[PDB]
Amino acid sequence: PQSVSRAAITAAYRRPETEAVSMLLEQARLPQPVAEQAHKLAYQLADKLRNQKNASGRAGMVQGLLQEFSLSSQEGVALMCLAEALLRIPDKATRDALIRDLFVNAATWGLLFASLSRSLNRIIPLIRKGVDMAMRLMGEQFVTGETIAEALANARKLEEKGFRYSYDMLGEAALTAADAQAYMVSYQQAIHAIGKASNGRGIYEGPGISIKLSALHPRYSRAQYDRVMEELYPRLKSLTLLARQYDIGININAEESDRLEISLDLLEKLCFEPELAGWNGIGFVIQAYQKRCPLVIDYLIDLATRSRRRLMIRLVKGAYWDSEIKRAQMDGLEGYPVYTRKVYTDVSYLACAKKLLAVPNLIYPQFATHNAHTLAAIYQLAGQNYYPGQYEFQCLHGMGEPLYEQVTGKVADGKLNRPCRIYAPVGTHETLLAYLVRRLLENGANTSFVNRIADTSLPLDELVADPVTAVEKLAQQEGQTGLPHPKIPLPRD
Ligand SMILES: Cc1cc2nc3c(=O)[nH]c(=O)nc-3n(C[C@H](O)[C@H](O)[C@H](O)COP(=O)(O)OP(=O)(O)OC[C@H]3O[C@@H](n4cnc5c(N)ncnc54)[C@H](O)[C@@H]3O)c2cc1C
Ligand SMILES: O=C(O)[C@@H]1CCCO1
């Protein structure tokens, strides 16, 4: 028999969406004054973000001409090309007298170097080489260094601005015993390096490491409890003891949903190690896109109480959504372990944030998001009288820095003065594929905030719309609250 909290997690695994969403709504709802302040802040953040270098303003002037002289696009370009040429005439008199007398982003790929389709048909082995090269080219912006020494030697610039770091030695899903052993050695090496760089700064101000359980056990995806405890656990314990010796945070990343249960069993055992008594540097990620998330929080609150520590909890939405949907459709079970509409995940995240903020003695919440509304909502939900150890934000390298440039830093310089920990992937091209693919899915999805904010045609108010209000609007149109995505039927259907 499971504990009361562990049993509740199990029962919520694939809860119908109507039910799960309906239950979250009032926990996610911001009180009117808070909601109004969250909106104003969210709008302001998104406005400064979108309109650094005057993007909307420039797009506006371009429309106004392209509207006036009833011109098309390509005409506008042609007109600008001429205008540029006329402006290169050194003397104004001379100038005035002269006057009066599949392949979507092929453009962006161009700055690097129909008619395209045929061109592709020809050369099609070069595909395998194309894929590897496009991976490196696109993945570079997301990587902080090839080695941990390199990544760490780049830390000062933002750390002196009040940013923090969590380093990730890229690579996951070890296939062989040898692979897992190599990941173990890489993590150990990394902890020594990060710990020496940290130099006693501690789990809050100083850098930490993020690890993947799938890297530390071969074929983790189908591994049984007994072997995981016998082989993976002693490794997890050894790394955590080493992190503690250097007093740095060690965070257990969250991966596929069918590994949630075993990861909790590992965390449970870890928190009761005598050598970790009184130390609060253990971190654990929870994914708000799962129906189980609020139930996992109740479990974690009880675990912190029983094991007498403050847990570092990273609340995220989740990185594996596309694969989770595909997996559930293959398994043919009674439902999905994740929500099927993005706005429901948003609602879940806010309800979960409130739960975490209510227990500051038990949990240090780490709010990972690139979404300006989510950030503004958490900022208001955390209440008056911020203190640094209350919570932090987190962001991925290559995605979060512009938004967080408005957040981390001095109030005098126009910032919110809230700390942000940057997640810093470290590795060579051989380790990059899986992480890169997830970033493509995140950045390229039309439901993603980072995709929607780039679209100067989507009004700011829509971009930062309250998710609870959005869910009620759907419910009034559709006939009940929390209906699944119309294009994502149940697996058995
Ligand atoms: C520092 C950091 C660490 C992270 N660590 C982890 C981790 O260990 N494990 C992990 O799984 N994730 C992790 N993530 C989250 C993941 O990588 C994405 O960055 C995150 O989900 C983006 O959320 P958002 O608030 O930035 O963006 P938003 O655009 O607000 O939200 C996007 C998210 O919505 C969800 N979503 C998209 N479509 C749908 C849909 N149709 N139905 C329901 N939900 C949908 C997905 O979770 C998607 O990522 C981490 C993120 C950060 C910043
Ligand atoms: O790997 C990923 O895509 C997420 C983001 C960071 C850790 O888990």
UniProtKB/Swiss-Prot annotation:
GO biological process: negative regulation of DNA-templated transcription; proline biosynthetic process; proline catabolic process to glutamate; response to oxidative stress
Keyword Iron appears in the UniProt entry: no
Induction: By proline, autorepression and catabolite repression, and is potentially nitrogen controlled.
Region spans: Proline dehydrogenase: 116-457
Highest taxon in the source lineage: Bacteria
Annotated signal peptide: none
Keywords on record: DNA-binding, FAD, Flavoprotein, Multifunctional enzyme, NAD, Oxidoreductase, Proline metabolism, Repressor, Transcription, Transcription regulation
Record GO cellular component, one term: cytosol
GO molecular function: 1-pyrroline-5-carboxylate dehydrogenase activity; cis-regulatory region sequence-specific DNA binding; DNA binding; DNA-binding transcription repressor activity; flavin adenine dinucleotide binding; identical protein binding; proline dehydrogenase activity; protein homodimerization activity
Sequence intervals crossing the membrane: none
Subunit structure: Homodimer.
Family: In the N-terminal section; belongs to the proline dehydrogenase family.
Role of this protein: Oxidizes proline to glutamate for use as a carbon and nitrogen source and also function as a transcriptional repressor of the put operon.
Name this protein carries in UniProt: Bifunctional protein PutA
Organism (species): Escherichia coli (strain K12)
The gene coding this protein: putA
Residues of the full protein shown: 87 to 610 of 1320
